[PDB]
């Protein structure tokens, strides 16, 4: 122990601290940002709503929002809210299955629109 201080001594002797002062810098979806289109497994198109470590499972989990009802989640995984979407549109897929949708893959885009208000008089 630190034998040579005295005066000011706190109460910190817990027997559990895997990481507190130093935390390993580990990232996978650093290039991907929230609010962008992504292709799950290069087949299932959608939008990146979430991306990071979850509670139900370990590892990076990106909550892509499929334009069509193909997913099996609504943003909330076992109660844990991550993003907003239909009942079965949002799907959590690993980072490895996260790629940018080809520019030639959007004949018509006009979905996702819940936030709509007009407080002020425009």
The DSSP 8-state label assigned to residue 91 in this structure reads E
Is position 82 within any domain? yes
Is position 14 within any domain? no
CA distances from 94 to 51, 57, 85 (A): 9, 11, 19
Q: What is the C-alpha separation between 1 and 85, in angstroms, rounded?
A: 53
| Residue 105: partners with Cβ closer than 8 Å, 6 or more residues away | 39, 45
Is position 36 within any domain? yes
Is position 4 within any domain? no
Q: What is the number of structural domains in the chain?
A: 1
Sheet containing strand 90-93, strands side by side: 90-93, 60-66, 44-53, 36-40, 98-99
Q: For residue 30, how many other CB atoms are within 10 A of its CB?
A: 8
Q: Which two three-digit tokens encode residue 90?
A: 């949002």
Is position 83 within any domain? yes
Q: What is the C-alpha separation between 92 and 62, in angstroms, rounded?
A: 5
Domain carrying residue 73: 27-112
Kindly report the CATH number assigned to the domain that includes residue 36: 2.30.30.190
Is position 62 within any domain? yes
User: CB of 75 within 8 A of CB of 83?
Assistant: yes
The CA radius of gyration of the chain, in Å to the nearest whole number, is 21
- Token match 């130093």: residue? 22
Q: Which two three-digit tokens encode residue 97?
A: 């299955």
Is position 15 within any domain? no
Q: In Å, how far from its chain's centre is CA 43? A: 20
User: CB of 40 within 8 A of CB of 46?
Assistant: yes
Q: In Å, how far from its chain's centre is CA 14? A: 31
């Amino acid at each position: 122990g630190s034998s040579g201080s005295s005066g000011v001594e706190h109460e910190q002797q817990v027997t559990e601290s895997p990481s507190l002062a130093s935390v390993p810098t580990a990232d996978e979806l650093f290039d991907f940002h929230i609010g962008d289109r992504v292709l799950i497994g290069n087949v299932q198109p959608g939008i990146l709503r979430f991306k990071g470590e979850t509670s139900f499972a370990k590892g990076f989990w990106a909550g892509v929002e499929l334009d069509k009802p193909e997913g099996n989640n609504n943003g909330t995984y076992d109660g844990i809210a991550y993003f907003e979407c239909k009942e079965k549109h949002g799907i959590f897929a690993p980072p490895q299955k996260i790629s940018h949708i080809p520019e030639n893959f959007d004949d018509y885009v006009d979905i996702n629109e819940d936030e709509d208000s007009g407080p002020s008089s425009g």
